[PDB]
């Protein structure tokens, strides 16, 4: 459901891993349940700590 949504947002018909990653890490519960699970070829949610941003 969520990973299909993630694909449409990246204009893709075919769900790749990163869609699954994006889907899981942004759903609090699924993220909890898959807390110690590594998703292959799924990289990391974009996060950059505020105090690192300039100006």
């Amino acid at each position: 459901e969520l990973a299909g949504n993630a694909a449409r947002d990246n204009k893709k018909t075919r769900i790749i891993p990163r869609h699954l990653q994006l889907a899981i890490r942004n759903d609090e519960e699924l993220n909890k349940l898959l807390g110690r699970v590594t998703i292959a070829q799924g990289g990391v949610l974009p996060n950059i700590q505020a105090v690192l941003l300039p100006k």
Partner: protein, 98 residues
């Protein structure tokens, strides 16, 4: 000429590598290391290409996750640079060392 101010290439180098998933260690180097480290536990072993990539997909996931924790520690010290005494604090709290 023109040049970007120390950091602004980094911030980009972040945005780039967060939005992507390609494995960031060179495949063959890694694989030699794996067989180096494997000879320890048994000689003349053989690996399925996939089994190397399974390891490489983990190592990278782990190190990435570590640096994340590392960075939050460096920042806790009102710093921006990561240093060994940030990794070590993470790994201690994680429970990898004593």
């Amino acid at each position: 000429p023109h040049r970007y101010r120390p950091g602004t290439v980094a911030l980009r180098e972040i945005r780039r590598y967060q939005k992507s998933t390609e494995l960031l260690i060179r495949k063959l180097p890694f694989q030699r290391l794996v067989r180096e480290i494997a000879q320890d536990f048994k000689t003349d072993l053989r690996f399925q290409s996939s089994a190397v990539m399974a390891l490489q997909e983990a190592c990278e996931a782990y190190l990435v996750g570590l640096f994340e924790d590392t960075n939050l520690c460096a920042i806790h010290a009102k710093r921006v640079t990561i240093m060994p005494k940030d990794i070590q604090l993470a790994r201690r709290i994680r429970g990898e060392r004593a």
